[PDB]
Amino acid sequence: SYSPPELEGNAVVSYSRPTERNPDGIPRVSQCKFRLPLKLVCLPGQPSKT
Amino acid sequence: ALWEDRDVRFDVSSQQMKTRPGEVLIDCLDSVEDTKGNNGDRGRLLVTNLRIVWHSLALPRVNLSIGYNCILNITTRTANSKLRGQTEALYVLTKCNSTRFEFIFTNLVPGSPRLYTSLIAVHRAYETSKMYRDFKLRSALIQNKQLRLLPQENVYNKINGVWNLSSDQGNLGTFFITNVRIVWHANMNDSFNVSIPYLQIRSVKIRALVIESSQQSGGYVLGFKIDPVEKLQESVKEINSLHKVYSANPIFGVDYTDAFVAYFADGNKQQDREPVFSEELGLAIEKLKDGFTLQGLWEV
Prior knowledge:
By secondary structure, chain A is mainly β. Chain A has strands spanning about 10-15, 25-35.
């Protein structure tokens, strides 16, 4: 029922680089954030004076 | 003549590490550190056809050569957990001319530990095949009436009525000639058979089919006598030909300094005092060392 604090969302990938000391892979993390539109949480409605 | 599979040598030369004619390399692994000697130096491990070799890979002079007829136990130890990958380690226990050594081989880079498996395999192949390169008396060679052949062995000449000039009354027996070894059974209580390998033969001459052993089975002179000597010289010449053509490239039938002092399995002990009886325990016990007593060694 309540509207979210912000429409932005995050997406995070955690992967591994296989190497010589640790062939199991050093773990790395990288992220990107998208911006959602008002058309997902709002609608055009009637306005009030006060 | 052949020592690669019979001794354990340290600081071996760059030539004796090279593959003998009958020998053949199988698997190799770099960066195998040597331990039980705390030099902390890397190397390279080789599992050949007759022995295992390790050379320092940076100072290739210092090295180790361990024969397969001088190893007792080979154990792989998978440890050193999550902190890095599962690295293995090889523990080899050796006993050459009553002296016990132990070598440890640590795979530093955890990315290639497969070697330690194949070794085990070939070692079995080394022990399951000793009728190819060793001398044996009175073994279980004969089937119902014929010879039980090794894998890489077929008979050449099948001669009946070949005597043995080492006994008195159990002589007349068949003589089998093969490409790996020559055998003679007794045709009467056929468990008095001798199976001499070409590897142990030193010289086949006549004085009568005299065969001498190559200082490993002792000076075992074997004398046989046959029917009129035509077939006799025929057999001698064909035996010499087969001996030479084998010695050209040996077979081995394997299917598929103070250096010593830092590798003792006991610890500052290369010895075994004379085993004498023990009135305390009732067992044959090693002689006690100049003042020590059993009930004083047992307690703590």
